[PDB]
């Protein structure tokens, strides 16, 4: 396992502390065993996601003093403009207050577009893998949402270089079995979150393209985490070598018509999204009017013009190389030492999170018991680390029979921040987890004592078997 | 005209230049003749709103600093819970990214809700005025939405202590024409904002909500200035003559049910918004399911933890009286200068801006040629002051004909921003509409270069005649 | 009296409070009748000053946030000496912590340079008027400080252009009397503060430095309010009637071989002072050694790198034409609504305060029972205004005889912050002020409770007669 | 070698850059191969110093924030006394804006203090190791500065608890030598900077204290890193093994009668003195006195109020086990990687720094060469860390004698700014150094190019033999 060292220095800490554990014990059972219900003040590390968490520069905060708070034209809106530009080449923004709010934008105006024509009767959107916010918006709509990522993603233990690449034949047989009059958009997810933060390929997002623009379908790159995926193209694609960050990302978005993308992530924000449209003005006139209602007017959408100035200085900080290098080697160097120990996780490691798989952990546990959540909630009460699961818990119920949805993978979740926790904090996740192999065994499975009919996964109560 | 002196003392400027005339000139050319396009360096002082434009203290980038970024659970999420069960009593409280957020959470569901008994076939919201964005998620989700405020608020001139207040006589036949199972709610806007920003008495409030209740109708308090109108209960109200501006604003909320609120107005933010519930657990629980993929997780609601802990310290520095006097008694000055040299105005001022109408200036330029913004442009031309049109432009066509509704009003909203200007910059603003009195006569009328089917107001193109 | 526009908006406030009567007769007592031992606390509106309580800009805060702390070769360091080859065309400069920190670095190095050459036996400097540190500081190392202003200046209510000149006869007559051997260096204060903070015009300035050239004498300009004296300049000497501030500023440094420079006046800050030597090296070598043990390494000279941004931010605002028209036109229309009530002040106004010359208020108090502190404890104990004695209090005993020293002027100085305070705040002084013209024929008169030997205004307890 | 894990996680980054070897190199010759001359921006981890280049914590970035700036009276020197009389039970306070502004205002007046009653004839100052401006104040006082450091401290490789010590004979015999009369003031220098910051034990502290009483002689605390010694005592004391680290301080100020501070140590400030005096109220007013012409006003003595709110806060955060812990933890673990290198180190490490021996690494340079200079600038040239070189080139030149003076030591001095940099910043010197073991043989040694007569190390510029 190898440690990188960062290439900036600290200026501004925030306390952190580990609680008691008595008091672990105490907030675990207060929150019914489920971490999402705990105060952040019974956590010391918390690896519940890499959303909004991130740790700013001094040149952000700076950026933010001097925002333009004006209702309309605010200065920044218009740099946010040419950073939109220059980036990605594409010339229509939107602001969002964050990622969900800009798919929220996007998505009904792109169904509206296409039904406009008389086409999407039986509308689906796909992509190589819908984040859950991403696809809440795509059933919200009365659509589909179908996932085609690849099945070497599934082959957690087997390397591969581009586990988050569309598996084409399934896109060209989806086509074909759905129509393309049918298929409102092609969503590419860079890089596929819910197959561990894995990248996709250059090559695989230009054939994604290449097919969708032959059968004229619109093409979104879900963008979260877009440096961490130009990232690993530069690092495996032998033809990205000696090319730039900006340089991959420029080429990137030659492969996609917009862009929705969650500001939290990648961009190293604590709040702020954006659509972006590359050159169809009618899709930015209809995405605007919706902006309106559900966002705020269109050259802040939702955000304070601190927060604009901020994303113009992170979109750029947030493709350098050297800062790339050192947190993607960070989260390599989390799961090393977590496999050099024989714990197994998807591998290789993606952008931003560690993905542990818990079947193999604690094998007397039963899906249905939610055995990433018992290994989740072991780890808290030892070390008071906050992790999420990405299981049966998570996949809910199937409506025909009301019985425990199957999981295929039950993994936790080791989500990091940007810029905010050290090596050494790895390292204190690391031995929390490798010290629970000999109390796997005992480990019992969980109840429910409160089962909310949607959305489970954040306010159900649990107890332990 | 009385100048009352501020209750602080400045801790950070911002500098604002007047461009020359012939910046101006060009400046407004190129923004085809509509302020609303203009970018905010070509403005000098800025009355298009009082939203998201104030100034905070120090203590509240204090509390910015220190705020807790945390995905669930943030510290800030916990002191917002309480700072609303301390102002209002309510025990629910989903944190929104700004007020149209809160809207767009809270209104669908207690349609559904209404619903869902089998109720609301032809469903109605009914309110003394619907704020714009209010009432266009009333019309989204399929509802009517009726206005019933006095008709002492169309008489201008003539000074009245509430003309905010409903009519309890149009209240009473609106239920009685539509039936209370068709009514979603009541929402009571408050000051209300459309009339001019002026209060709804408290026996108004008491009124509307017992009706409400012997009808089961939900009422929900429109909040973005209820710290103006709880100053305005306190100043004309002989009952609340020795109360505290806290225990009006206590009193006035057990005349709902809930609330949303654009923290962007009174409690002094730049970004943010509230849904408090009183005690509807079912109603906060489906509020909540909204909440996810609409603004984000519940205990942030698209706000950063930063914004939440802004928010908890604009709260109690809203209320403050010293503060509520002083900001409340600029607008009134600004009100005064103009009355005092014979320019119209809405009488007496509400609390957040001053009302002009423009008919009664340019009597030659009929509403289809845009009085107001033919007052609004020169007004920049002469000044670099940017107000905002309440009329025939923003009345726009009627669908049916496209034919150019009538406004019974062609007002000029100076809209007043909280802590930002002082009485001296309210003198300028004031001396320069004074300045156009000869020239109102030669006013011309301005036509459409570029006309869009909706978002007139803000993107079109206009020439003058 | 005319109330000149703010050219920026509020961004922040900080909220000051008016204690009650109750409270300041408590907290006066408490302070042994002596403004200068109240806590900030007791007070409303501070006028004790205009140093270090100015209200710094966005782009200020901004650059003290991204400003490098580095101990040696400071990114503002370099930034720093490049603004002061801008302004000045110094080539040398030492940054310090402030004025009095500049004064001990410069002072001694200047002394001990001309004893070097066998000079200096019988120590002189030569000011229009030493500020009381400057005075300390030539007191302190053995000197005389002599002060030559023209007599101009002492006559209050008779206008002149420029009362902070030099009376050129007196300089030639002291040169002869003391010869150029013990003339250390002359001080040129710009503005004259001991004066009122009145204006040394150009070709004073011109006159005043070929005098010393011919002579060989050093020429120190004082320089804490040099754009005040700048703006007065260029708005009073046809010669410069169309120059900009900083063409003025440039041809005054040509008539200073060094300068000292408080930067918590004119430059906008709150702590901060700079040394900037126009071309001798080996003075500023000398400087250089006092320098660290006295202030700092001299990269940093006793300042965080963040005050050294905000510094070389603040010395280009502290230069814009429109801030100070406002400023120094703020200072007028308090000293015009004085004079137009009959108070007599020190006439015209100087650029940060205005003198209220207490001789004829109160007449029926004598200069050792302290007539400008009896109006000074008045205001305050009426208003909550502090304000500072510029009189015999300050003025001291006298160390030959020990009994009260004789004072020409009994002046109270309502000394004004930079970008505070609004006119609505001088109306508030002035109508304290002017609601006390009856009673200032009873007032009393002060005794002392407790005298220390040096220093006495600073911390006397005195009490009423 | 063990890592101890930061007790906090970082909110702002600031961004460090290493630096080409082509730029590195010609950075250095332009700098004349002399880093005290090396602007920031070509430095990639800086270990100049430890003083002012802390990071902060949110909570002190926010006390700035509602700092104070009344030039009297500011609420932050009121707290910041309490804060004095809570740590140290010390009664009377003056800020000052770094420590040696803290020294100038303090060791004049002891001098004047002891003169007054007829002593202090051959006056002298004596302390465990006297710093290098403390030295430098006594000096320009006209006094002896005699240091009296156990022997202990000499001995490199040698374990011992209490290095800093005072050596109790030395002491004894100097206060017979000279005469109690002639001693001014006896220095505890706490940690012992100048021994390689080494603690002090509480019962060296005590005997120190007692001897001083027993002849009435003043002894002055000299405080910069006071937690960093209160730290080793609780470590290595087994009398104060079970107590907090403020029960630790509170003991040892019993054993002083005044303090002097540069808060820019471990109070974790970027700028910062005080004074305190535990009761003489004679010394404090004295000291008062002085303060007013050389710092500012008595109530914020050259600080901002800002600065004064940070101390505050500062004081409370240095004084927590769990930072220190980390903190010094930290020091050990780079001197653990170099020691366990076989690189020669003072032992065990102090609380801030690790002295390295360059004499036994580079044996072929004599000390007029330049030996710890010649690795610095190879460390420098290999990692673009920079460091300070305590040896030959900064002892000088003997006064009457005018050669080269003899080093014991060539030492290196590794020092670390605390809460910036990471352990793996640590590795990245630690490995630097370690990889330069082959390439030390061939190492030449280096010349003046140009050397200044005082200012000789900050200054001078070199060149390689
Ligand atoms: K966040
Ligand atoms: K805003
Ligand atoms: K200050
Ligand atoms: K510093």
Same mark, same amino acid.
């Given at each position: 396992?190898?440690?990188?060292?960062?290439?900036?220095?600290?200026?501004?800490?925030?306390?952190?502390?580990?609680?008691?554990?008595?008091?672990?014990?105490?907030?675990?059972?207060?929150?019914?065993?489920?971490?999402?219900?705990?105060?952040?003040?019974?956590?010391?590390?918390?690896?519940? #996601?890499?959303?909004?968490?991130?740790?700013?520069?001094?040149?952000?905060?700076?950026?933010?003093? +001097?925002?333009?708070?004006?209702?309309?034209?605010?200065?920044?809106?218009?740099?946010? @403009?040419?950073?939109?530009?220059?980036?990605?080449?594409?010339?229509?923004?939107?602001?969002?207050?964050?990622?969900?709010? !800009?798919?929220?934008?996007?998505?009904?105006?792109?169904?509206?577009? @296409?039904?406009?024509?008389?086409?999407?009767?039986?509308?689906?959107?796909?992509?190589? *893998?819908?984040?859950?916010?991403?696809?809440?918006? %795509?059933?919200?709509?009365?659509? @589909? !949402?179908?996932?085609?990522?690849?099945? $070497?993603?599934?082959?957690?233990?087997?390397?591969?270089?581009?586990?988050?690449? *569309?598996?084409?034949?399934?896109?060209?047989?989806?086509?074909?079995?759905?129509?393309?009059?049918?298929?409102?958009?092609? %969503?590419?997810?860079? #890089?596929?979150?819910?197959?561990?933060?894995?990248?996709?390929?250059?090559?695989?997002? $230009?054939?994604?393209?290449? &097919?969708?623009?032959?059968?004229?379908?619109?093409?979104?790159?879900?963008?979260?985490?877009?440096?961490?995926?130009?990232?690993?193209?530069?690092?495996?694609?032998?033809?990205?070598?000696?090319? #730039?960050? @900006?340089?991959?990302?420029?080429?990137?978005?030659?492969?996609?018509?917009?862009?929705?993308?969650?500001?939290?992530?990648?961009?190293?924000?604590?709040?702020?999204?954006?659509?972006?449209?590359?050159?169809?003005?009618?899709?930015?006139?209809?995405?605007?009017?919706?902006?309106?209602?559900?966002?705020?007017? %269109?050259?802040?959408?939702?955000?304070?013009?601190?927060?604009?100035?901020?994303?113009?200085?992170?979109?750029?900080?947030?493709?350098?190389?050297?800062?790339?290098?050192?947190?993607?080697?960070?989260?390599?160097?989390?799961?090393?030492?977590?496999?050099? !120990?024989?714990?197994? &996780?998807?591998?290789?490691?993606?952008?931003?999170?560690?993905?542990?798989?818990?079947?193999?952990? %604690?094998?007397?546990?039963?899906?249905?018991?939610?055995?990433?959540?018992?290994?989740?909630?072991?780890?808290?009460?030892?070390?008071?680390?906050?992790?999420?699961? &990405?299981?049966?818990?998570?996949?809910?119920?199937?409506?025909?029979?009301?019985?425990? $949805?199957?999981?295929?993978?039950?993994?936790?979740?080791? +989500?990091?921040?940007?810029?905010?926790?050290?090596?050494?904090?790895?390292?204190?996740?690391?031995?929390?987890?490798?010290?629970?192999?000999?109390?796997? !065994? #005992?480990? $019992?499975?969980?109840?429910?004592?409160?089962?909310?009919?949607?959305?489970?996964?954040?306010?159900?109560?649990?107890?332990?078997?």
């Amino acid at each position: 396992a190898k440690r990188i060292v960062e290439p900036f220095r600290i200026k501004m800490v925030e306390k952190i502390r580990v609680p008691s554990r008595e008091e672990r014990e105490a907030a675990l059972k207060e929150a019914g065993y489920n971490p999402f219900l705990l105060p952040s003040s019974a956590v010391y590390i918390d690896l519940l #996601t890499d959303s909004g968490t991130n740790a700013m520069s001094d040149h952000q905060w700076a950026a933010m003093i +001097t925002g333009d708070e004006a209702y309309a034209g605010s200065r920044n809106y218009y740099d946010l @403009k040419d950073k939109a530009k220059e980036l990605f080449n594409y010339d229509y923004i939107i602001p969002a207050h964050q990622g969900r709010g !800009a798919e929220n934008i996007l998505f009904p105006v792109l169904l509206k577009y @296409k039904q406009k024509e008389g086409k999407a009767k039986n509308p689906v959107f796909i992509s190589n *893998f819908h984040f859950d916010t991403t696809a809440a918006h %795509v059933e919200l709509n009365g659509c @589909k !949402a179908i996932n085609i990522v690849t099945e $070497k993603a599934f082959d957690s233990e087997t390397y591969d270089d581009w586990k988050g690449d *569309f598996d084409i034949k399934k896109l060209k047989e989806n086509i074909a079995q759905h129509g393309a009059d049918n298929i409102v958009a092609i %969503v590419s997810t860079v #890089t596929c979150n819910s197959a561990g933060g894995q990248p996709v390929s250059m090559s695989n997002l $230009k054939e994604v393209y290449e &097919i969708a623009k032959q059968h004229g379908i619109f093409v979104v790159m879900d963008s979260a985490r877009f440096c961490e995926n130009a990232y690993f193209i530069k690092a495996r694609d032998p033809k990205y070598k000696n090319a #730039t960050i @900006k340089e991959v990302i420029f080429d990137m978005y030659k492969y996609a018509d917009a862009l929705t993308m969650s500001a939290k992530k990648d961009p190293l924000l604590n709040i702020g999204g954006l659509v972006a449209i590359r050159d169809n003005e009618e899709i930015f006139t209809l995405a605007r009017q919706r902006c309106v209602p559900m966002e705020g007017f %269109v050259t802040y959408g939702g955000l304070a013009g601190r927060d604009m100035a901020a994303m113009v200085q992170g979109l750029e900080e947030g493709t350098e190389e050297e800062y790339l290098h050192y947190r993607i080697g960070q989260v390599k160097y989390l799961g090393d030492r977590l496999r050099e !120990a024989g714990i197994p &996780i998807q591998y290789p490691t993606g952008g931003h999170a560690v993905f542990v798989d818990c079947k193999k952990l %604690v094998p007397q546990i039963p899906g249905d018991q939610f055995p990433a959540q018992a290994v989740i909630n072991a780890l808290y009460l030892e070390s008071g680390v906050r992790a999420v699961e &990405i299981g049966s818990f998570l996949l809910g119920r199937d409506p025909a029979t009301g019985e425990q $949805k199957h999981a295929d993978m039950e993994f936790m979740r080791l +989500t990091i921040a940007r810029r905010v926790y050290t090596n050494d904090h790895m390292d204190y996740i690391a031995d929390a987890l490798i010290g629970l192999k000999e109390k796997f !065994a #005992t480990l $019992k499975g969980l109840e429910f004592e409160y089962e909310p009919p949607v959305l489970r996964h954040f306010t159900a109560r649990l107890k332990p078997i």
